[PDB]
Structures are given as C-alpha cells and as structure tokens.
Target: cytochrome P450 BM3
Amino acid sequence: TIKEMPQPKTFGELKNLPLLNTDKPVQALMKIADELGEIFKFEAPGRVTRYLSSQRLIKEACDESRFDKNLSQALKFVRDFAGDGLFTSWTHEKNWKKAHNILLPSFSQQAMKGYHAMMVDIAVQLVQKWERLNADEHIEVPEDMTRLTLDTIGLCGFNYRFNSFYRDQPHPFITSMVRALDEAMNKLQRANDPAYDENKRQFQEDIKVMNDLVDKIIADRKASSDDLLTHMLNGKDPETGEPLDDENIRYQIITFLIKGHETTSGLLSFALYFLVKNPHVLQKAAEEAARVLVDPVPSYKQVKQLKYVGMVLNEALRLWPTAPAFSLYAKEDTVLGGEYPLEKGDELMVLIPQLHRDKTIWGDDVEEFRPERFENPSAIPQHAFKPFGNGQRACIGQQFALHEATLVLGMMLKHFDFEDHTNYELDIKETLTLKPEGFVVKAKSKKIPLG
Ligand code: HEM
Model:
C-alpha cells in the first residue's frame, strides 16, 4: 500500500544538498543507497529526484509506456553544448526520431565490418607505442585508452585523424571536454552568484575549443566515404523525408566525438584494472587471446570469437558502468512498485552501479570480479544488467564500443604481460562519467610481431 518514500536527512532550506558536497557524487549516492535501500527521494533547492537501485523497481521504470527519458540537470548543462543531438534531445523532439532513423544504419553489422580495419589501424598504433617504451618506463592507462577511443571514432565516424598518439599531452579537444564535463558536474551542487563568473567564462571557452574541431571536420569532408558523417550530410528520415539541418549536424558531430569515445576509454581502463588485480582471470583471458588471434593482425570474426574477453568487458561494466546513471520522467500520473504514487513529470534516476549490486539478482558476492557470471547471459534476468540504458533511448553505439574494446583488449593480452608495479589503489574520477584516475602499469612485450 501507499508507502512513505525514504529520504536522507534534510537541513532546513539546504534540503539534502550538504550530503552531496563532493567531487564523487555518484559514489556518495551509492553510500546513501546502501543505507536506505532500493529507493530514496533526494531534494536540492528548487529540484527533486528519486534514486532507484533494485531490479524490481528499475524493471517498472523501464516500461516506456509509462516513463520516458529525462534530461537530468547534468544533461541539461551538457545540452548547453550538445544541443538536440541524439544524447541530449527529448524523445518528443523532432530531431530525436529523425537523427535516430538517419544515423542507425551506421551501426549495422554491415557497417561494423567496414569499421574493423580502421579500428585495427589505431589498435596497432597503441601496441606500437607500448612496444617502443624503454624499460624504465610505464603506461598511463586512462590517457592512452583515451588516445585510442578518440582516434577510433574520429577515423570510423568522420575520416579525421586526431593523431592522438603523436602528442605526449592530451589532444586539445580532450582537455576542454574534461573541464566542461567537470563543470556541469560542479554546477549541480551549487545552491545559488558572481562567485561563479570565471567558471561560466572558462565554460564558454571550453565549448569554443570543442566547436573549433567541428569546423575543422566539416571543412575537411567539404574540401574533398560512407560513414556517420556521410549519413549526417546526405541521409533522409524514411518517415518525414527530411534531412538534418546544419545546426543539428553540428550537434551530432559534438555528441559523437564525446559519447563516441569517453565511456569506452573508461571501460578499457577498468577492465585492465580488474585483470591485473585478478591474476587467475588475466591468465585465462590471456590464454584466449593467444589461441584465437593466430594472425599478425586480428580479423573481424576472430574478435567475435573472443568470448571470455567479452565476459571480462561485461563484468567490468557491471561493477563500474562508465555512464553510471540515466534519468526518466513519468509520462502520466502513476504508481511505482505498487506503493509509490507519482505525478506526471516526476523524475527518477537509475543508479546503475547499485542495480548491478542487487544481491537478490546477482547473489552475495557482488563486489567480486567474476567474468564467468556472463557464461550464458540469457540466464540473467531482464533489466538486471543495463550499462547501455533502456529501450529506444538505449546506447546506439553499444556494438561499436564492444567491438572496439574486445579487439583492443585481445591485442593487449596477446602482446604484453602487465605489471601492477605501484600496487595501484582504485580511485574513481567522476566527470559525470567514470574512470580510474592515475591507473598506471608496466607492460613487458611478449615480442610478437604485428602485421
Ligand atoms: C562502454 C561504452 C559505452 C557505454 C557504457 C555507453 C552508455 C550509454 C548510456 C547509458 C546511454 C543512455 C543515456 C541516457 O539514458 O540518458 C547511451 C546513449 C547513447 N550513446 Fe552510448 N555508451 C558507450 C559507448 C558509445 C559509443 C561507442 C557511441 C557512438 C559511437 C555512443 C553513442 C551514444 C548516443 C548517440 C546515445 C544517445 C542515444 C539516443 O538517445 O538516441 N555510446 N550510451
């Protein structure tokens, strides 16, 4: 029957805000979830949401007849630069369904097979960097994974070479992206001011940097292909018959550059992190790579054969889903879990890391890294594993990401032995998305030739 919704302690007008005075808000929220359970309300001056953590409640929230995708305050802040592209558009916005239809063919297996060779180009450039390090040297993992994933989406999506591996510091686009994402995150924990005038002005500067690349890409395709850029330029929605106007296209370039690389990078960092911490898992994933990748460079089918590598990727997404949250709103008045009445417009947040720790679904060893959980995935209940969102608003890039990751991890495992030389202590940085900050390793080459 009509239950009272749990809520953390409120502090007069501050509401629940003093509890999220942190650079790690998602990890803080996980703490409040362990304390209060599957659902809690959370209020901040002028705004309210409900955090869900259980499969039973998230199953219901994922019913698209009752709840649609919502733009959390965080995505509202990012919509300041990504506009009405795929990721920051409302489902009822014209350009959502339209860009969806227009851009979907770029993620068909047909197109996926055509991306493979460009993926290998960047993968090799990674392996070669590591082959060429001197003995006194180590690898900065999130940093190099970011070089790979940015370059990969640049080449596959846009035929643009970011040449991230010819730069010892991050590409200029990355530095702006990261400072902007951080700022959208800082903006959330501010109750109300001319104290934030510089943050607003760096925020506009960070946007212009990003946009400067867009024009560069736009002008490169111009001044001279069947890819994402192509369909953005030529494609027409098989419904309305209309193409995307110039303004939307620029929003899509930006959308894809960011979303098209950052969460994949975090996944590869975490996966490698868990491998070097779980040496019996590493050995087994390294056995699979040596056996399957019998060629100097990997083929498309061989990547498909790397089954245990895929299990490792999925298990790493279970523990640390790199886009750790997605928001929903009630299309109409409704009752949630048969106990929580909700009003048209009310917001729900899906705390994916808590979902992935639901013991009633996963058992009592949720913190353990066990790729074998995914041995036969059809066994896993529906809506229990959701690192790619839900329904028609799920990740469009899912298979792209996993193909990229599996290929790259497979080659890593084939070509090197990794050492956790600083006995790295997990430290998860939040820029809305998640990554293990400061993760470093040593890779000793197995001295196996590339093709
Ligand atoms: C492990 C890697 C990835 C993860 C965990 C991930 C996660 C997600 C999540 C959770 C959403 C839903 C957001 C929400 O409901 O508010 C989403 C949507 C989206 N993703 Fe991914 N992503 C990954 C890689 C990629 C890649 C490689 C691309 C492009 C090549 C991409 C492009 C997009 C786009 C455009 C959307 C918006 C889709 C729509 O609403 O139409 N993502 N992703």
Observations:
- The chain has one domain: 1-451.
- The radius of gyration is 22 Å.
